[PDB]
Amino acid sequence: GLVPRGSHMNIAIIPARGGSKRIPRKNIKPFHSKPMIAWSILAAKKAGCFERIIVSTDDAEIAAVALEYGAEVPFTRPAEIANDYATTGEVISHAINWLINQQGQVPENVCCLYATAPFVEPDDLCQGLELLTFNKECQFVFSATRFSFPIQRAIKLDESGWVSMFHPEYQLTRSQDLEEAYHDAGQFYWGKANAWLNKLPIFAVHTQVVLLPSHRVQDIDTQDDWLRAEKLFT
Amino acid sequence: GLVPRGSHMNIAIIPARGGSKRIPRKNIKPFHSKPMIAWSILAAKKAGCFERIIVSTDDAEIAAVALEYGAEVPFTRPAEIANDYATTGEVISHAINWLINQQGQVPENVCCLYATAPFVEPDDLCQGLELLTFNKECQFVFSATRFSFPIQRAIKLDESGWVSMFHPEYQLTRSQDLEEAYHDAGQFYWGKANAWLNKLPIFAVHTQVVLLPSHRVQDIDTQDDWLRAEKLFT
């Protein structure tokens, strides 16, 4: 863990908490015959732009699996309570301060990579760094994806199933004429260390995205989702 | 083609035009080793709630394939021009008037089923009828699906890649507190015959939906999409 004199310290933090309600043991449940978190550690390792890849967990079993797959677990966070679910920003800040305070290493660019993100592309990770660093004023870069249907044409259902538009002014508007819309794909978030530390708001500062195609963005929120995403990963 | 005395005339119309720019011959291109339109005719036949299943096309080759798979092609529309792409409503109205005028049969409930809709469930088709008919004032029922990410948190990109929110007032709003949003899945549209004939606006009248789960709603807009949707259909 020597580094070039003059190089910038770029790291991956992979948060993972125990306790997930919908899919028990979600972060270590097998996905295509590895614990789910393995795929994120593996992608971070293959990307080649990180000098450290750390799992931040509050759970000793998850810690064990992360070490098994070659991530660093330099600390274990104390178990969270349900009425105090730590935000991503709180976990990332914790890790950055811990590195500074406990190890005297000052991160510059910090990538939060989700534990459940098995279609993440090593290359998208590196593209995000490059966008973060090329644009001097950029504080964050996150994985995003296009909405597959125009948000302007969204409808709501009343309590009796009756349809109405959210925005009736677009009822007759040409599709070509609707402004393109995107959302957070929920896979990775690069930020400048000071951005995370200062709790800058990602969607309101100088933020860029790496755009992922729809097929690489997969919901894995239920057991039925986990099955369908396994069948597709093969 | 005898019917019970006192029964209501319920039909499927499957529009199909030639000329598709992105996927040539899209409506008859093989999908899992049948022409794409076959899957829609097949589902309509299996649903068991239609007394006629008609393909409305402007193309003799498509007509041939539709007859081959057991749809009726009682007429061929004259080829369209590119500067006069007929709306769904125009095609449906044409077919309904044609049945009345040319054959003296008056449709009551009319289902427009897209030619490219291979994950459509026979049962969803029948559920739509039942919703159309149970609710006296209902003019339309269409296949819809939830947005997978909240539309209120959508972002836009300026010409330099810079992120901003469409609706900054929701920057800190709880996910639980966002109103659920849906969109037209683009698979089928039931309507009362008079609704189609009177050109009633689907999203502004008495309209219901049949809600399809995300995995059954698949984009098939490109050649790469056609491949991925074949791999999944197996």
Tell me the domains of chain A and their CATH numbers: 10-144+181-233 (3.90.550.10)
Helices and strands, number each (H, E), in chain A? 6, 10
Q: Which one of A166, A183, A202 has the shortest CB-CB distance to B181?
A: A166
Interface test with A, best of B155, B199, B218, B224 (most A CBs within 10 A): B155
Give SS3 for A14.
strand
Q: Which residue has the tokens 């090329």?
A: A134
Chain B residue at shortest CA distance from A181: B156
| Cα distance between residue A17 and residue A82, in whole Å | 11
Q: Do B154 and A207 touch (CB under 8 A)?
A: no
CB burial readout B138-161, b (16+ within 10 A) else e: bbbbbbbbebbbbbbbbbebeeee
| Cα distance between residue B13 and residue B40, in whole Å | 10
Rg (CA), chain B: 19
Longest Cα–Cα distance in chain A? 66
Q: Which one of B161, B166, B219 has the shortest CB-CB distance to A148?
A: B219
Contact, A190 vs A141, CB < 8 A? yes
CA separation, residue A54 to residues A72, A73, A104, A124, B126 (Å): 5, 6, 16, 19, 53
Q: Do A162 and B207 touch (CB under 8 A)?
A: yes
Give SS3 for A109.
strand
φ and ψ at residue A199, rounded to 5 degrees: 55, 45
Contact, B139 vs B209, CB < 8 A? no
Contact, B73 vs B52, CB < 8 A? no
- β pairing state of B140-146 and B207-211: parallel
Let me know if B123 is exposed, middle or buried by CB neighbors in 10 A (0-12, 13-18, 19+).
middle
- Rounded to the nearest 10°, the torsion over CA A156, A158, A160, A161 is 0
| Cα distance between residue A40 and residue A14, in whole Å | 8
B82: its two tokens: 């590119």
Residues 159-218 of A with CB under 8 A from B: 161-166, 168, 171, 179-184, 201-204, 206-209, 214-215
CA separation, residue B98 to residues B102, B106, B159, B191 (Å): 5, 10, 49, 17
> Within 10 A of B111 (CB to CB), how many other CB atoms are there?
26
Q: Do B147 and A149 touch (CB under 8 A)?
A: yes
**Alpha helix segments (H runs only) across A137-234:** 193-197, 223-233
| Cα distance between residue A140 and residue A117, in whole Å | 19
Longest Cα–Cα distance in chain B? 66
> Within 10 A of A158 (CB to CB), how many other CB atoms are there?
8
Instruction: Tell me how the structure was determined.
Output: X-ray
Resolution at which this structure was determined, Å: 1.9
> Within 10 A of A9 (CB to CB), how many other CB atoms are there?
16
Interface test with B, best of A149, A159, A172, A189 (most B CBs within 10 A): A149
Q: Which one of A155, A181, A214 has the shortest CB-CB distance to B166?
A: A181
| Cα distance between residue A101 and residue A94, in whole Å | 10
A111: its two tokens: 């990538």
Let me know if B215 is exposed, middle or buried by CB neighbors in 10 A (0-12, 13-18, 19+).
middle
* E strand or H helix at B142: strand B140-146
Q: Which residue has the tokens 């469930």?
A: B121
